[PDB]
Amino acid sequence: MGLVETLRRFRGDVTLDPDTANPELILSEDRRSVQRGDLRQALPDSPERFDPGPCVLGQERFTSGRHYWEVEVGDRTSWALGVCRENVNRKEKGELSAGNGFWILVFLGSYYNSSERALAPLRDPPRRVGIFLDYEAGHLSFYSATDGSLLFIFPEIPFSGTLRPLFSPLSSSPTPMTICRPKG
Protein backbone atom coordinates (compact mmCIF):
# COMPACT_ATOMS: atom_id res chain seq x y z
CA MET A 1 0.00 0.00 0.00
CA GLY A 2 2.06 3.00 -1.35
CA LEU A 3 1.36 6.30 -3.21
CA VAL A 4 0.87 4.60 -6.65
CA GLU A 5 -2.01 2.37 -5.26
CA THR A 6 -3.71 5.50 -3.80
CA LEU A 7 -3.27 7.75 -6.90
CA ARG A 8 -4.74 4.92 -9.10
CA ARG A 9 -8.03 5.97 -7.36
CA PHE A 10 -8.01 8.91 -9.90
CA ARG A 11 -8.89 6.39 -12.72
CA GLY A 12 -12.06 7.53 -14.51
CA ASP A 13 -14.97 5.60 -16.08
CA VAL A 14 -15.09 4.73 -19.77
CA THR A 15 -18.08 3.09 -21.48
CA LEU A 16 -17.80 1.73 -25.04
CA ASP A 17 -19.89 3.22 -27.92
CA PRO A 18 -21.51 0.21 -29.64
CA ASP A 19 -22.14 2.26 -32.87
CA THR A 20 -18.29 2.53 -33.37
CA ALA A 21 -17.47 -1.21 -32.82
CA ASN A 22 -16.10 -3.32 -35.67
CA PRO A 23 -18.73 -5.98 -36.54
CA GLU A 24 -16.50 -8.85 -35.32
CA LEU A 25 -16.56 -7.37 -31.76
CA ILE A 26 -19.18 -8.12 -29.08
CA LEU A 27 -19.83 -5.76 -26.13
CA SER A 28 -21.10 -6.57 -22.64
CA GLU A 29 -24.45 -5.30 -21.40
CA ASP A 30 -22.63 -2.75 -19.18
CA ARG A 31 -20.41 -1.61 -22.15
CA ARG A 32 -17.16 -2.07 -20.08
CA SER A 33 -16.07 -5.35 -21.83
CA VAL A 34 -15.31 -6.20 -25.47
CA GLN A 35 -14.33 -9.50 -27.08
CA ARG A 36 -13.26 -10.32 -30.64
CA GLY A 37 -15.04 -13.32 -32.23
CA ASP A 38 -14.41 -14.93 -35.68
CA LEU A 39 -17.83 -13.91 -37.21
CA ARG A 40 -18.93 -10.74 -38.96
CA GLN A 41 -22.30 -9.75 -37.39
CA ALA A 42 -25.30 -8.07 -39.16
CA LEU A 43 -25.07 -4.50 -37.73
CA PRO A 44 -26.43 -1.24 -39.15
CA ASP A 45 -23.52 0.44 -40.98
CA SER A 46 -22.53 4.12 -40.76
CA PRO A 47 -19.39 6.27 -41.07
CA GLU A 48 -18.96 6.02 -37.25
CA ARG A 49 -18.30 2.19 -37.30
CA PHE A 50 -14.65 0.91 -37.57
CA ASP A 51 -14.37 -1.41 -40.59
CA PRO A 52 -12.08 -3.17 -41.29
CA GLY A 53 -10.03 -1.88 -38.24
CA PRO A 54 -10.92 -4.17 -35.24
CA CYS A 55 -11.59 -1.19 -32.89
CA VAL A 56 -14.27 0.38 -30.69
CA LEU A 57 -14.26 3.88 -29.13
CA GLY A 58 -15.24 5.05 -25.63
CA GLN A 59 -18.24 7.41 -25.44
CA GLU A 60 -15.92 9.90 -23.61
CA ARG A 61 -14.60 13.01 -25.46
CA PHE A 62 -11.31 14.64 -24.39
CA THR A 63 -10.85 18.36 -25.29
CA SER A 64 -8.58 19.35 -22.31
CA GLY A 65 -7.21 18.22 -18.93
CA ARG A 66 -5.65 15.08 -17.41
CA HIS A 67 -7.34 11.65 -17.78
CA TYR A 68 -6.32 8.20 -16.47
CA TRP A 69 -8.07 4.86 -17.15
CA GLU A 70 -7.26 1.16 -16.61
CA VAL A 71 -8.03 -1.87 -18.80
CA GLU A 72 -7.79 -5.53 -17.74
CA VAL A 73 -6.33 -7.56 -20.66
CA GLY A 74 -5.19 -10.56 -18.47
CA ASP A 75 -3.04 -13.24 -20.26
CA ARG A 76 -3.36 -11.44 -23.66
CA THR A 77 -0.27 -11.18 -25.89
CA SER A 78 -2.30 -9.09 -28.40
CA TRP A 79 -4.12 -5.76 -27.90
CA ALA A 80 -4.06 -2.07 -28.96
CA LEU A 81 -4.97 0.81 -26.60
CA GLY A 82 -4.85 4.58 -26.77
CA VAL A 83 -6.70 7.53 -28.29
CA CYS A 84 -7.59 8.92 -31.71
CA ARG A 85 -9.04 12.11 -33.19
CA GLU A 86 -12.85 12.09 -33.33
CA ASN A 87 -12.49 12.80 -37.11
CA VAL A 88 -10.20 9.84 -38.11
CA ASN A 89 -11.17 7.75 -41.17
CA ARG A 90 -12.89 4.78 -39.40
CA LYS A 91 -12.89 2.92 -42.79
CA GLU A 92 -9.04 3.19 -42.98
CA LYS A 93 -7.79 -0.10 -44.59
CA GLY A 94 -4.03 0.47 -43.99
CA GLU A 95 -2.12 1.10 -40.75
CA LEU A 96 -3.70 3.12 -37.90
CA SER A 97 -0.78 5.53 -37.43
CA ALA A 98 0.02 8.81 -35.64
CA GLY A 99 0.09 10.47 -39.11
CA ASN A 100 -3.66 9.64 -39.55
CA GLY A 101 -4.67 10.71 -35.97
CA PHE A 102 -4.24 7.34 -34.12
CA TRP A 103 -2.02 7.31 -31.03
CA ILE A 104 -2.10 3.65 -29.92
CA LEU A 105 0.21 1.19 -28.15
CA VAL A 106 0.10 -2.23 -29.86
CA PHE A 107 1.23 -5.45 -28.00
CA LEU A 108 1.96 -8.09 -30.74
CA GLY A 109 4.38 -10.55 -29.07
CA SER A 110 6.89 -11.23 -26.28
CA TYR A 111 10.68 -10.84 -25.76
CA TYR A 112 13.12 -13.54 -24.54
CA ASN A 113 16.85 -13.46 -23.95
CA SER A 114 19.50 -16.19 -24.25
CA SER A 115 20.32 -17.78 -20.80
CA GLU A 116 22.35 -20.73 -19.31
CA ARG A 117 20.50 -23.70 -21.05
CA ALA A 118 17.60 -22.15 -23.02
CA LEU A 119 15.78 -18.74 -23.48
CA ALA A 120 14.34 -16.74 -20.50
CA PRO A 121 11.16 -14.60 -20.88
CA LEU A 122 11.91 -10.89 -20.00
CA ARG A 123 8.76 -10.04 -17.95
CA ASP A 124 5.23 -11.29 -17.35
CA PRO A 125 2.95 -9.48 -19.84
CA PRO A 126 0.81 -6.81 -18.05
CA ARG A 127 -2.65 -8.06 -16.97
CA ARG A 128 -3.72 -4.46 -16.32
CA VAL A 129 -2.76 -1.42 -18.39
CA GLY A 130 -3.07 2.21 -17.30
CA ILE A 131 -3.38 4.93 -19.94
CA PHE A 132 -2.59 8.56 -19.02
CA LEU A 133 -3.59 11.56 -21.19
CA ASP A 134 -2.45 15.15 -20.42
CA TYR A 135 -4.04 17.14 -23.30
CA GLU A 136 -2.28 20.52 -22.73
CA ALA A 137 1.17 18.75 -22.29
CA GLY A 138 0.52 16.80 -25.57
CA HIS A 139 1.27 13.72 -23.35
CA LEU A 140 0.08 10.08 -23.82
CA SER A 141 1.74 7.28 -21.81
CA PHE A 142 1.04 3.63 -20.89
CA TYR A 143 1.89 1.62 -17.74
CA SER A 144 1.65 -1.83 -16.20
CA ALA A 145 -0.82 -0.72 -13.48
CA THR A 146 0.04 -3.61 -11.07
CA ASP A 147 3.84 -2.87 -10.84
CA GLY A 148 3.77 0.80 -12.11
CA SER A 149 6.32 0.23 -14.97
CA LEU A 150 6.29 2.55 -18.03
CA LEU A 151 5.37 0.56 -21.18
CA PHE A 152 5.49 3.48 -23.69
CA ILE A 153 5.35 7.28 -23.96
CA PHE A 154 4.65 9.13 -27.24
CA PRO A 155 6.75 12.15 -28.26
CA GLU A 156 4.89 15.39 -27.45
CA ILE A 157 1.70 15.38 -29.65
CA PRO A 158 0.14 18.66 -30.88
CA PHE A 159 -3.44 17.62 -29.89
CA SER A 160 -6.17 19.73 -31.47
CA GLY A 161 -9.96 19.09 -31.30
CA THR A 162 -11.67 16.12 -29.67
CA LEU A 163 -9.89 12.84 -28.76
CA ARG A 164 -11.65 9.50 -28.13
CA PRO A 165 -10.27 6.54 -26.14
CA LEU A 166 -9.69 3.55 -28.52
CA PHE A 167 -9.76 -0.19 -27.68
CA SER A 168 -8.71 -3.07 -29.96
CA PRO A 169 -8.57 -6.73 -28.92
CA LEU A 170 -6.32 -7.99 -31.78
CA SER A 171 -6.99 -11.78 -31.29
CA SER A 172 -10.03 -13.98 -30.56
CA SER A 173 -9.60 -15.17 -26.91
CA PRO A 174 -11.93 -16.43 -24.13
CA THR A 175 -10.50 -13.34 -22.22
CA PRO A 176 -12.55 -10.13 -22.70
CA MET A 177 -10.77 -6.78 -22.50
CA THR A 178 -12.44 -4.94 -19.57
CA ILE A 179 -12.38 -1.24 -18.56
CA CYS A 180 -11.95 -0.97 -14.74
CA ARG A 181 -14.76 1.07 -13.08
CA PRO A 182 -13.77 3.99 -10.77
CA LYS A 183 -13.17 3.08 -7.08
CA GLY A 184 -16.10 3.70 -4.66
Residue numbers in the entry: 276 to 459
Published text:
TRIM family members typically contain a RING domain usually catalyzing ubiquitin transfer; one or two B-box domains mediating protein–protein interactions; and a large coiled-coil domain region, which is involved in self-association or oligomerization with other TRIM E3-ligase proteins. About two-thirds of human TRIM proteins feature a PRYSPRY domain, also known as the B30.2 domain, in their C-terminal region. All characterized family members shared the same overall PRYSPRY twisted β-sandwich fold consisting of a 7-stranded and a 6-stranded antiparallel β-sheet.
A notable exception was the TRIM11 structure, in which a unique subdomain swap was observed. In chain A, β-strands 7 and 8, usually located at the edge of the concave 6-stranded β-sheet, were displaced and interacted with the corresponding region in chain B, forming a hybrid β-sandwich. The equivalent β-strands in chain B, however, did not interact with chain A but were disordered, resulting in an asymmetrical dimer within the asymmetric unit. These observations raised the question of whether this domain might form a symmetrical subdomain-swapped dimer in solution. However, gel filtration analysis showed that the isolated TRIM11 PRYSPRY domain is largely monomeric in solution. An interesting variation was observed for TRIM11, however, where two β-strands of the 6-stranded β-sheet showed increased structural plasticity, resulting in this segment either being disordered or forming a hybrid sheet with a neighboring molecule. While this assembly is stabilized by crystal packing, it nonetheless reveals the intrinsic flexibility of the swapped β-hairpin motif in this family member.
